[PDB]
């Protein structure tokens, strides 16, 4: 809340089936203990990314990690968090939203 | 007086309508001297971005130019880099493609 926070990013949607490239501006964060965290009703994920994606502290380039319903019909709103495990402090919430996809090889 | 250098895009390609946001991180630069320019045979403009859109010293957000042709009918190769307009000094150049926007 006066720590972790998110300042801005290049998409607020992405494919339900995640993978989508994400570039994250926030404040001053350790690449080694901070994370990006997705949650909604009774659902967690984190976005993908190594220590090498975290940009002079201040900025993230990860993937959105799949949605938990692949079968998704309508876009769904979830939140996105920046996470700091050491101490579990949490940014205030963005909002993001799941859009359907379809994967032709996954009936 | 240090180097400028881009580290990573979001996007190499866009409209020659131009209009699309790109995220650029770069090495450390000061948003009161520093503008990123495209570059062709005949041509050159700049990202549009204000000192508010440079984060921390080490990022800019910014809308590309429109490009000298409006009416693409296949890509164009123009170099994209940074520029400090106090001296002129340049960052190495990455390839951008101005497309079709149809």
Redesign the interface.
């Known amino acids: 809340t006066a720590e972790l926070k998110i ?2 990013v ?1 998409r607020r949607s992405g494919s339900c089936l995640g993978g989508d ?1 994400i ?1 994250l ?1 926030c404040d ?1 964060v350790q690449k080694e203990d901070i994370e990006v965290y997705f949650t909604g009703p009774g659902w967690e994920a984190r976005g993908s990314f190594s220590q090498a994606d975290v ?2 502290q ?2 993230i ?1 990860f993937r959105t990690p799949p949605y938990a319903d692949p079968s998704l019909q309508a876009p769904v709103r979830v939140s996105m968090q920046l996470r700091r495990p050491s101490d579990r402090e949490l940014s205030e919430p963005m909002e993001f939203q799941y859009l359907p996809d379809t994967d032709d090889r996954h009936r």
């Open positions: 300042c801005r290049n490239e570039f501006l001053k940009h002079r201040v900025a380039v």
